[PDB]
Ligand binder design. Structure first.
Ligand SMILES: CNC(=O)[C@H](CC[S@](C)=O)NC(C)=O
Length: 167
């Protein structure tokens, strides 16, 4: 398989992970902590010590089935790109919205996508578009959280992932 990876931050990684895991073309989704100032942070560090990390989902997708653009469109369906450090009740910099890339050629792709998304929003978009500085896997307890606990905390509607994309 020809795969690619992209890092997405859009609030609680429980809902976001579950969301991307149900999309045909997504090979994997790992919840972790990205672009922080500390190394190997625990949930407690990120949540209370202000290590600066953002709850992020590492998404691996079939580069032959989906484009980075498709992934971004899916992402825009469940993330409010206009709220600063807040998605639902999850408030704090650890829930900031952002797209982190490992390839510099993707910055222009992400920026262009954000510009198109901005066309349909009256309020200014506040989604970060930055390189993946650092990524650290969240505790195993957090992996496949909603698959293990179907009635677990989730404020995004994962059924939006079933709706097809243009053409
Ligand atoms: C009980 N609810 C929570 O713990 C969620 C955190 C889940 S997120 C994947 O960090 N937030 C609050 C405020 O309770």
């Amino acid at each position: 398989m020809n795969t690619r990876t992209i890092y997405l931050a859009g609030g609680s990684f429980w809902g976001l992970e579950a969301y991307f895991q149900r999309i045909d073309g997504v090979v994997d989704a790992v919840s972790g902590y990205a672009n922080g100032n500390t190394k190997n942070p625990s949930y407690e560090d990120v949540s209370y010590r202000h290590t600066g990390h953002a709850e992020t989902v590492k998404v691996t997708y079939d580069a032959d089935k989906l484009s980075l653009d498709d992934i971004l469109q899916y992402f825009f369906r469940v993330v409010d790109p206009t709220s600063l450090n807040k998605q639902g009740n999850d408030t704090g910099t650890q829930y900031r919205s952002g797209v982190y890339y490992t390839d510099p050629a993707e910055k222009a792709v992400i920026a262009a996508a954000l510009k198109r998304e901005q066309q349909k929003y009256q309020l200014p978009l506040v989604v970060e578009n930055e390189p993946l500085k650092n990524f650290y896997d969240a505790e195993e307890y957090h992996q496949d959280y909603l698959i293990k606990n179907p009635n677990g905390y989730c404020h995004i509607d994962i059924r939006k992932a079933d709706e097809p994309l243009p053409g």
